[PDB]
Every structure is written in C-alpha cells, then in structure tokens.
Amino acid sequence: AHMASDNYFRIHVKKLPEENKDAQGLWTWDDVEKPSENWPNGALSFKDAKKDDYGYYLDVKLKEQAKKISFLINNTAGKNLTGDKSVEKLVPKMNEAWLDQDYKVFSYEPQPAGTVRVNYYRTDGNYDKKSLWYWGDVKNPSSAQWPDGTDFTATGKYGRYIDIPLNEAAREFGFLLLDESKQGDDVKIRKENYKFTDLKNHSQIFLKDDDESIYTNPYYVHDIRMTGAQHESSFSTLILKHSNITNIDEAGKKVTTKHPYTVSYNSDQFTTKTSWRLKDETYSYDGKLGADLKEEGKQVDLTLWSPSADKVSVVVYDKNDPDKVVGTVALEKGERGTWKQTLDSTNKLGITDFTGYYYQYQIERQGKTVLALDPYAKSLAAWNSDDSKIDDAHKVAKAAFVDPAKLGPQDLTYGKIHNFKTREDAVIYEAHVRDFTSDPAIAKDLTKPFGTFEAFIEKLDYLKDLGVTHIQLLPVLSYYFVNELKNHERLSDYASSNSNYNWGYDPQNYFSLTGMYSSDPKNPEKRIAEFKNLINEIHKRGMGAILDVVYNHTAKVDLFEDLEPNYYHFMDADGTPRTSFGGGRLGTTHHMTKRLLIDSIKYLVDTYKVDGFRFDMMGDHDAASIEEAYKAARALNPNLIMLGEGWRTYAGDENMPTKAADQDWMKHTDTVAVFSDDIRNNLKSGYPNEGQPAFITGGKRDVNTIFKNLIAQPTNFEADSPGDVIQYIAAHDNLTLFDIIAQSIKKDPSKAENYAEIHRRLRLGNLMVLTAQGTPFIHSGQEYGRTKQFRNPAYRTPVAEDKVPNKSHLLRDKDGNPFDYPYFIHDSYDSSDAVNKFDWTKATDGKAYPENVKSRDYMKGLIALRQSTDAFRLKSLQDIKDRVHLITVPGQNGVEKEDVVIGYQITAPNGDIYAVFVNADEKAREFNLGTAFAHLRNAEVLADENQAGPVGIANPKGLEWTEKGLKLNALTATVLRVSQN
Numbered sequence: 001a002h003m004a005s006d007n008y009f010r011i012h013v014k015k016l017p018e019e020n021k022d023a024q025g026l027w028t029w030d031d032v033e034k035p036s037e038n039w040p041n042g043a044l045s046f047k048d049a050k051k052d053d054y055g056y057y058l059d060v061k062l063k064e065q066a067k068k069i070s071f072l073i074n075n076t077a078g079k080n081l082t083g084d085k086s087v088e089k090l091v092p093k094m095n096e097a098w099l100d101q102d103y104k105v106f107s108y109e110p111q112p113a114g115t116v117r118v119n120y121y122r123t124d125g126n127y128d129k130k131s132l133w134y135w136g137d138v139k140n141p142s143s144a145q146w147p148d149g150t151d152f153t154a155t156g157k158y159g160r161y162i163d164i165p166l167n168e169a170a171r172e173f174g175f176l177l178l179d180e181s182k183q184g185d186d187v188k189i190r191k192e193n194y195k196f197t198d199l200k201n202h203s204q205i206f207l208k209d210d211d212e213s214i215y216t217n218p219y220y221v222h223d224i225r226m227t228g229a230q231h232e233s234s235f236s237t238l239i240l241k242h243s244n245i246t247n248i249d250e251a252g253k254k255v256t257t258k259h260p261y262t263v264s265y266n267s268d269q270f271t272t273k274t275s276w277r278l279k280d281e282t283y284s285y286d287g288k289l290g291a292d293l294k295e296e297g298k299q300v301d302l303t304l305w306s307p308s309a310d311k312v313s314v315v316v317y318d319k320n321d322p323d324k325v326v327g328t329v330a331l332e333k334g335e336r337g338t339w340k341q342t343l344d345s346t347n348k349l350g351i352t353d354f355t356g357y358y359y360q361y362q363i364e365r366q367g368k369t370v371l372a373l374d375p376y377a378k379s380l381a382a383w384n385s386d387d388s389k390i391d392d393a394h395k396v397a398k399a400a401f402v403d404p405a406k407l408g409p410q411d412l413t414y415g416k417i418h419n420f421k422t423r424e425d426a427v428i429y430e431a432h433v434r435d436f437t438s439d440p441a442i443a444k445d446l447t448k449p450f451g452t453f454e455a456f457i458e459k460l461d462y463l464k465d466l467g468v469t470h471i472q473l474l475p476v477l478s479y480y481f482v483n484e485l486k487n488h489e490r491l492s493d494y495a496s497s498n499s500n501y502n503w504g505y506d507p508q509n510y511f512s513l514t515g516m517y518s519s520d521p522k523n524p525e526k527r528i529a530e531f532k533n534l535i536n537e538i539h540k541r542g543m544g545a546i547l548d549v550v551y552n553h554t555a556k557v558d559l560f561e562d563l564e565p566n567y568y569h570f571m572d573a574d575g576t577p578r579t580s581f582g583g584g585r586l587g588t589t590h591h592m593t594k595r596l597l598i599d600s601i602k603y604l605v606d607t608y609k610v611d612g613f614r615f616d617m618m619g620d621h622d623a624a625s626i627e628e629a630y631k632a633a634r635a636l637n638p639n640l641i642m643l644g645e646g647w648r649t650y651a652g653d654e655n656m657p658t659k660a661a662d663q664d665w666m667k668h669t670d671t672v673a674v675f676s677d678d679i680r681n682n683l684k685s686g687y688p689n690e691g692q693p694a695f696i697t698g699g700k701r702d703v704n705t706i707f708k709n710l711i712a713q714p715t716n717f718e719a720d721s722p723g724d725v726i727q728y729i730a731a732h733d734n735l736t737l738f739d740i741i742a743q744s745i746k747k748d749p750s751k752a753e754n755y756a757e758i759h760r761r762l763r764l765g766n767l768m769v770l771t772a773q774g775t776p777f778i779h780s781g782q783e784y785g786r787t788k789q790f791r792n793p794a795y796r797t798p799v800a801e802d803k804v805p806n807k808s809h810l811l812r813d814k815d816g817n818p819f820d821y822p823y824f825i826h827d828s829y830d831s832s833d834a835v836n837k838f839d840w841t842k843a844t845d846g847k848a849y850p851e852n853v854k855s856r857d858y859m860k861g862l863i864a865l866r867q868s869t870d871a872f873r874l875k876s877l878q879d880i881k882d883r884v885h886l887i888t889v890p891g892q893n894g895v896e897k898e899d900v901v902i903g904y905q906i907t908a909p910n911g912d913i914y915a916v917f918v919n920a921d922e923k924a925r926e927f928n929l930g931t932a933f934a935h936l937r938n939a940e941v942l943a944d945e946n947q948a949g950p951v952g953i954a955n956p957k958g959l960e961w962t963e964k965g966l967k968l969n970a971l972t973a974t975v976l977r978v979s980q981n
C-alpha cells in the first residue's frame with residue numbers, strides 16, 4: 001500500500017499519552033511533504049488511526065531525498081504530550097518507526113521485555129536446516145545434543161526469526177548460526193562465536209548470510225558511520241584504512257583550496273560545505289545594503305549580499321497589482337560577494353517613478369532558481385500566508401521601493417520622557433497594538449479603523465494619565481502567519497487557536513513594518529506614515545516607545561537560506577540549519593547576521609525615532625552582538641534603553657560555546673536589563689509551575705529572599721546594578737495577574753467577595769512591584785485586573801477532551817470544583833479578540849466596575865508615588881545597601897523565617913524616610929517597630945487599603961498604631977513617609 005511507496009513513512013504507537021484518541025494528534029515537521037500547521041488541531045488525528053498488533057499507526061507523506069522526520073503527539077489542549085521526537089531515515093527504503101510506551105524511538109517493532117527477537121536473513125532464501133545455538137543471559141540456553149539448535153521456522157519482515165526468552169536484567173548473550181545439513185565444523189556458518197553486548201537497549205538483532213556483524217536495525221547499517229564533511233567529519237558514534245578524499249575526537253563524535261571536496265568512509269559519500277567562518281574571511285561586507293530610493297523616486301540603488309550565486313536579478317512587480325510582473329533586471333557582481341544595480345531613467349520597465357513598486361530577488365545557483373525577499377526591505381506588499389502555496393512568488397513577501405524620511409509627521413524626533421533620567425527611572429507598559437483598541441465596546445468611539453497604529457493614538461491619553469514612561473509594543477516588524485487583507489475583521493468568537501490574530505513572534509523581515517496594524521496594507525507607504533504618527537503622538541505626551549524585536553528566529557528557514565545557503569543560521573556539524581518552530585535560528589555570531597541585527601536596530605532608531613528595544617528570547621544570542629547593538633543604538637539616541645528575556649537558552653553553532661546574552665551576562669554589563677523571574681515566581685507563581693501558592697497568594701516565602709528581590713538583588717543571577725533588573729509579576733506570556741491570583745488562591749471570581757479578594761491581592765502585588773528597586777514593568781491591563789477567561793457560552797462547565805481550548809488551564813476551587821467558565825488562556829498568541837481585548841469599560845467605567853477602576857487608580861497612584869522621590873529608584877547597589885533596611889528581620893521580634901508579611905525602610909537622599917509594609921495574610925498582622933523605627937509613627941500615609949499617591953491620606957484605612965508598632969488589616973499594604981522638614 002503506502003509500504004509499497006518511496007515517500008510514505010509509518011509511525012507506530014505503543015500507547016497514546018492520554019485516554020481519548022479523538023483528542024490526540026500526530027504533529028510532524030522537517031522532511032515531510034506538508035509540515036503540520038495550525039497548532040494543535042492541524043496535527044494528524046488519531047481518530048482515524050489504523051491499528052496493527054502493536055498499536056496505532058499513522059502514515060505521513062514525504063518530500064526524496066527525505067532524511068529527517070520529526071514528530072510528537074499533541075492533544076486538543078494542545079500540550080506537547082510526548083515531547084519532541086525525531087527519526088533519521090537510515091537508508092532510502094526505511095519507511096517505518098515505532099514509539100514505545102516510554103516514547104523511545106526504534107527502527108523496528110520493539111519486543112516485550114524479557115525477549116530478544118533474533119532475525120536471520122539469507123540471500124539464498126534457504127532456511128531448511130538453519131538453526132540458532134545460544135547461551136548467556138537467557139532462560140533456556142541450548143541444552144540438546146549439538147548441533148541440534150533452535151530451528152528458524154517463523155518468517156518475518158527481515159528474514160526468519162526466533163524469539164528467545166530472557167532472564168531478568170539481561171545484558172549479554174552469545175550465539176552460533178548453524179546449518180545442520182553440513183557435518184562437523186561446517187555446521188557453523190561462522191566458526192567463531194557471536195556475542196551481543198547490548199540487551200539493555202535492544203530487543204531485536206539482525207543477522208544476514210555469513211556476515212560477522214550483529215546489526216541493531218533491519219537495514220544492516222553499522223553503528224559507526226559518517227554523517228557530514230567540512231571545511232572534520234560528523235559521525236554517529238566512535239579508520240585510516242576506510243577513509244578517502246578527492247575532487248579523532250570521540251567524546252564529541254568527530255574525526256579530523258577554494259572549492260568543494262568529496263569525502264567517504266566505506267559506503268557513505270559526502271559533498272563538502274564551507275564553514276560560515278571561511279565565508280566570513282572572504283565575503284564579510286560592510287557597505288550599504290538594501291534598496292535605496294533616490295532622485296525623488298526616479299532612481300534605486302540595489303545591493304544584495306549573495307556570495308554563492310551564479311546570477312541575480314531583481315523581479316519588479318506592479319505598484320497597483322503586485323501579482324503582475326513588470327520585468328527583470330540583472331544585477332552585476334560587486335565587492336565581497338555582493339550584487340548591485342542602479343535602476344534609473346535608463347530602465348526598460350516603462351517606469352518613471354519607482355515609488356511603491358514591489359520586488360523580489362531571483363537567485364540562480366547550480367542551475368536552480370529561487371525567489372527571495374530582500375532582508376533589507378523597508379516596506380512590503382500586503383501579505384497573506386494563506387496564499388503561500390500559489391507559486392514561488394507567494395512563498396515570501398514582496399518588498400516595496402519606499403523612502404521613509406519623506407513620510408509621516410516631519411517634526412518626528414526622540415522622546416523627551418517625563419520623570420526619566422536613567423534606566424531605573426523607567427516604568428514600562430507592555431501592549432499589543434491590536435489588543436489596545438479591539439474591544440467592541442469602544443467601536444462607536446473610535447475615529448480610526450480599530451486595532452491599528454492610528455486607532456492606538458486615540459487611547460494614548462489613558463496611558464499619559466496612568467503615568468507610565470515607556471510603552472513597549474509587541475512585534476510590529478513583519479511577521480508571517482497572518483492574512484493582512486483581513487485585518488479589519490473583528491475576531492469576536494472566543495477561540496484560542498486557528499485565529500488570524502497573532503502576537504507577532506513569527507518573523508519575516510527586520511526592517512519592514514507589519515501590514516496587520518495598517519489602515520491600508522495594500523499601500524506600502526501608509527504603514528510607515530501611520531507608525532511615525534503613533535510614535536510622534538506618544539512623544540508629544542511625554543512618553544517613549546520600546547519595540548519588542550525577535551531576532552532569535554525567523555518563521556521559515558527559506559527566508560534566509562534562499563539568500564545564501566548554510567550561512568545565516570546557527571547550524572549542526574553537517575551544516576544543517578538549526579531550527580525553532582520550523583524557522584531558522586539566526587546566528588548572530590556570523591558576521592552578516594550580526595550586522596543584520598545591528599543595522600536593523602540602527603535603522604529603526606533613526607527612522608522611527610524609538611526610545612528602546614525588548615529582545616525576545618535574548619539568551620539565544622551571543623552577548624557581543626547585543627552589546628554592539630546597544631552602543632550603536634545609543635550613539636543615535638543617548639537616552640535609549642534596552643531589556644530582554646535573559647533565560648538560559650543559548651544553543652549557538654554545534655560545538656562552539658559563546659558567552660550568551662542571558663541573566664548571567666548582568667554581572668559584566670550595565671546596559672541591557674533582564675526580566676526577573678525570581679521576583680515574579682516568589683510573589684505570585686510562574687511558568688512552569690503556575691498556580692503554586694506564593695507570597696501574595698497564600699504561600700509563605702523566605703522573608704530575606706523577598707527583601708533581596710525588592711532591592712533588585714534576585715537570588716538566581718547576580719545583579720551588580722539595580723538597573724540590571726526588570727521587576728515584574730505579569731507580561732503577555734502566561735496567565736494574567738488577575739487570572740493567576742484566582743488560580744493560586746482557588747477562589748472563583750464570579751463570587752463578588754472572591755472578586756474583591758483577588759483585587760486586594762492584585763493591588764498588593766502591584767504595590768510591591770512599583771516600590772521595588774530597579775525598573776518596573778507592567779503588563780497592559782495589569783492595572784485594572786485584565787482577564788483571559790474563556791467565556792464561550794458552551795464552555796460554562798468542563799467540556800469533552802476533544803473540545804478543550806488550546807493553551808488553557810482549568811481552574812478549580814478549594815473543593816476541586818471547576819470555576820464557572822473554568823477555562824483560562826495562559827498562552828494567547830493565537831487567540832481571538834474576545835480573549836485578547838483590553839477591556840475599556842473595566843479600565844475606565846468606575847460606576848460599572850468600581851473594583852477594577854479602584855485598582856486602576858491604585859496603579860496610577862503608585863506610579864505618581866514612585867515618581868515623587870528617588871527613594872524607590874536608587875541608582876547603585878552600594879547606595880541601596882546604605883539606604884534600604886529590613887524591619888521584619890527573620891529570627892528577631894519573633895519574625896518567622898518564612899511568611900506572607902514584610903516591612904522595610906528607605907532613607908531617601910534628601911533625608912526623607914519612606915517605609916513599605918505588606919500584610920498578604922488573611923488576618924490582621926502586627927509589625928514590631930522597636931526603638932529603631934519609632935519615628936515611623938510620625939509618618940504621613942501615602943498608600944492604604946483604598947488608594948495610593950505622593951500626597952498624604954487624611955483618613956488612612958486598614959492601619960492601626962499599636963504599642964509595638966503598626967498593625968495592618970488582612971490583605972493590606974501601606975507606604976509611609978516621614979519628612980524632617
């Protein structure tokens with residue numbers, strides 16, 4: 001059937017990870033015909049899986065020469081149930097694999113424990129008197145009269161076979177292949193014993209004819225074999241005799257003219273590829289790159305780096321119908337592997353003004369042609385990935401000839417940001433352009449199309465009122481999996497997968513803006529004007545703009561492989577691009593990839609006059625690239641700030657370690673800050689253990705650990721500067737603060753009392769964050785209690801396993817009972833506007849939602865408070881150790897080592913004394929002041945259980961002053977200030 005086919009692959013499954021097969025699917029990537037898309041339900045469902053004696057199997061179409069098939073089993077939920085799996089196709093006809101009940105992968109059907117199957121294949125097909133004589137770690141060794149061994153009678157897939165019962169923990173056995181039609185010694189097919197050493201790992205072995213080797217796969221490939229060559233050979237495991245070449249590091253499994261060589265070990269032959277490093281020696285190019293539109297549109301200077309190309313032409317498409325090809329113009333060689341051309345009045349395209357015309361690069365290598373996107377494109381044709389299968393032209397976007405300087409508000413320059421002098425002074429607010437205005441409640445209010453750069457301007461006053469200094473925007477650079485032609489359609493049904501909505505972490509280009517937030521994606525110029533406008537309006541309200549940027553990976557390997565093969569990405573030994581979600585991992589240590597990142601940073605700073613960047617998965621990069629970027633950015637805007645995700649994720653090029661730009665980098669630089677998961681996890685929980693009780697959610701924590709985090713000394717990386725630390729409890733990733741608090745305390749928000757309690761804890765957390773040292777970061781909607789509850793009317797109670805929303809948690813109360821509408825989305829990257837909308841009514845309408853608006857005013861107060869004195873934003877570790885002192889010290893005045901209370905004092909530079917007291921407990925708690933802190937009784941109260949700000953509260957609520965000190969009501973924090981003035 002498909003087993004009589006060159007390009008099908010059968011994956012067999014011992015047991016499905018979960019109970020219901022209707023809710024599970026086989027997700028595939030790498031060398032398959034159609035890699036699975038639309039997580040999770042685009043997976044091949046087990047609903048229709050056929051079944052053999054072993055279990056379920058599924059067949060997958062291939063795309064020859066297919067070598068690597070990757071797969072996993074997911075669910076509707078859609079968790080990655082098995083974890084990622086991978087099979088290498090050993091020979092062309094290896095068309096089957098098996099997953100065991102431990103999700104290990106075999107090239108043969110695994111046999112039950114306590115059994116080794118012995119497979120013997122004979123080219124001559126004569127098994128008549130063929131038998132096996134065996135001994136060792138087996139139950140019943142050959143005991144009869146020699147040479148009466150066990151007959152080979154059963155015929156299988158790989159010759160005849162014998163099943164041998166094993167002992168427990170079997171490790172070694174020995175055997176002889178016999179031909180009992182012979183006499184004396186000639187009954188031994190090979191005279192010398194066979195010994196198999198590896199019964200712990202294999203339940204089948206494979207023998208043929210009189211071959212001495214004991215094979216571990218049915219394709220008779222040896223254990224030691226070559227896998228790559230450069231220019232040092234990749235091996236499977238670990239010579240002079242068998243190696244050849246024309247035209248010994250075993251722990252790393254490795255063995256060690258300007259044109260390709262040919263290397264072979266026995267039977268496996270490899271064409272050599274150039275190291276990226278060699279490429280860099282000869283082609284490292286530092287001149288201008290891209291399409292620069294000059295002479296008022298009448299000329300274009302093109303430069304593309306493509307060293308390995310034979311020919312390069314620009315294909316020019318019509319400004320009014322991008323499908324129409326106008327013509328082609330050959331590029332000529334330039335310096336250092338570039339290709340160049342000047343398009344001017346001399347063109348044979350019938351073009352006078354090039355502005356708004358579109359283009360791709362037709363690249364010819366070894367007689368094969370591809371269409372590639374200029375990595376330096378400044379805008380793009382309207383993009384729809386749903387049309388990517390139409391032809392080569394639709395596989396990647398078309399670039400546009402544009403001139404950004406001329407577009408948008410001409411007065412545009414860097415922000416002059418209120419209450420901001422250094423990185424400790426910033427208050428970062430993280431918003432998605434679409435979320436911020438997609439709430440249908442404001443539809444009649446908006447004058448611009450919703451969810452766009454320009455609609456965003458209409459709600460900037462809310463943010464100015466809030467007091468934030470820096471608006472961090474989720475990716476506005478072009479991303480792939482999106483239909484921009486549908487950007488004005490409202491995504492009003494609840495859904496958490498298969499949506500046109502995208503957060504933007506699928507990068508297509510690093511210079512062009514996405515058309516998704518444009519009023520007109522078909523106009524390549526409008527998005528530039530619109531964005532420059534948004535940025536200008538942000539500045540004119542005394543704020544800055546920070547751009548989430550995603551250099552760590554692209555959406556598709558082809559985007560950069562088709563420009564120049566085996567260079568731009570991080571790669572394995574063989575030179576295979578390292579990948580992430582089907583795209584390439586960009587190798588920022590490679591000269592031209594490094595300059596891609598830096599040129600981009602420089603270009604977006606100069607063009608859009610932005611005030612900083614947030615690096616997605618920054619730990620994926622080398623530290624040097626990021627520091628270089630910081631320098632280059634600052635040379636243009638000396639007030640610019642950077643931050644990133646410094647998780648410890650560096651992979652890099654195989655066998656090449658580099659200092660990564662992660663949390664550990666902080667002890668060596670005072671430039672780019674990192675997110676502090678230590679504070680996040682300690683106060684409320686975090687990935688991957690969401691909902692674990694923690695400091696503001698009923699879970700006592702180590703009091704010193706809390707204090708350290710509050711002075712910007714997280715306990716999991718060294719911060720020698722408080723500006724190194726981005727302090728946060730919520731972000732676009734994971735559950736919202738409101739949602740995680742409800743999850744953690746197991747209280748359903750649909751009981752009004754629970755709603756009240758969650759908001760108390762929410763204010764608490766926000767207080768702790770906004771009075772902490774370092775740089776506070778606020779997830780958009782964190783101020784009002786934003787929710788991502790899944791409120792589809794059919795989802796009021798738990799649903800069938802095959803209807804569970806993608807990336808949801810089912811929240812339960814104390815009795816284990818589902819909340820009302822128990823599903824909450826914790827990863828909303830592919831969720832609709834119903835999930836993702838910023839709720840404007842909850843944020844602003846005090847009569848309809850007193851509690852939500854009370855929390856919003858609380859935030860606004862905390863930001864004013866923070867801005868009123870430098871006490872909370874001290875500029876050095878040393879000063880922080882001078883000025884900040886723990887009042888509730890573990891082991892004194894009966895202060896427990898772990899608790900849900902804390903108190904401390906700051907002596908500000910101007911001599912004012914500030915104190916922060918937090919009672920996250922469910923009863924009144926007393927803070928012992930002693931003699932040392934008696935002066936706090938003189939304080940004005942700046943924050944209580946109802947409100948916050950820099951002006952003293954006349955009638956403070958939730959406080960009682962006692963003999964010992966100060967007693968806070970349950971779920972109460974206070975900020976105190978004493979001014980000896």
Ligand SMILES: OC[C@H]1O[C@H](O[C@H]2[C@H](O)[C@@H](O)[C@@H](O[C@H]3[C@H](O)[C@@H](O)[C@@H](O[C@H]4[C@H](O)[C@@H](O)[C@@H](O)O[C@@H]4CO)O[C@@H]3CO)O[C@@H]2CO)[C@H](O)[C@@H](O)[C@@H]1O
Pocket residue numbers: 647648649677686687688733734807826827
């Ligand atoms: O496809 C993979 C997943 O992608 C998304 O996961 C996100 C998380 O939601 C983010 O929170 C972040 O994860 C960080 C994490 O915040 C950070 O604390 C750190 O966690 C480490 C921890 O330090 C270490 O001690 C140990 O416990 O391992 C943890 C890793 O699990 O590092 C994380 C990054 O590795 O970023 C990830 C990746 O984008 C998405 O939400 C998921 O649904 C999805 O499965």
Ligand SMILES: OC[C@H]1O[C@H](O[C@H]2[C@H](O)[C@@H](O)[C@@H](O[C@H]3[C@H](O)[C@@H](O)[C@@H](O[C@H]4[C@H](O)[C@@H](O)[C@H](O)O[C@@H]4CO)O[C@@H]3CO)O[C@@H]2CO)[C@H](O)[C@@H](O)[C@@H]1O
Pocket residue numbers: 027028029036039080084505506550552553579580581582616617827829
């Ligand atoms: O197709 C091959 C890949 O298959 C599997 O990957 C799937 C994930 O396991 C699954 O969670 C989901 O992944 C999405 C994330 O949940 C979502 O958060 C986002 O991830 C972003 C991330 O937020 C950002 O920080 C990072 O830099 O970019 C990520 C990618 O855009 O989108 C994810 C991708 O859709 O779906 C995946 C299938 O597409 C295997 O686990 C994976 O190893 C394979 O490569």
Ligand SMILES: OC[C@H]1O[C@H](O[C@H]2[C@H](O)[C@@H](O)[C@@H](O[C@H]3[C@H](O)[C@@H](O)[C@@H](O)O[C@@H]3CO)O[C@@H]2CO)[C@H](O)[C@@H](O)[C@@H]1O
Pocket residue numbers: 133134135136142146193
């Ligand atoms: O466990 C005890 C025993 O095991 C092994 O003996 C095996 C021999 O090594 C192996 O060659 C085979 O012996 C047969 C001869 O090859 C054959 O010419 C003729 O003489 O019959 C022999 C078997 O009776 O099989 C035995 C296992 O039966 C191990 O190697 C020995 O050292 C050990 O004594």
Ligand code: NA
Pocket residue numbers: 216217221222223
């Ligand atoms: Na092998």
Ligand code: NA
Pocket residue numbers: 443450
């Ligand atoms: Na509308």
Ligand code: NA
Pocket residue numbers: 716
């Ligand atoms: Na850690």
Ligand code: NA
Pocket residue numbers: 730731735736737738779780781782783786
């Ligand atoms: Na939030």
Ligand code: NA
Pocket residue numbers: 421870
């Ligand atoms: Na100041």
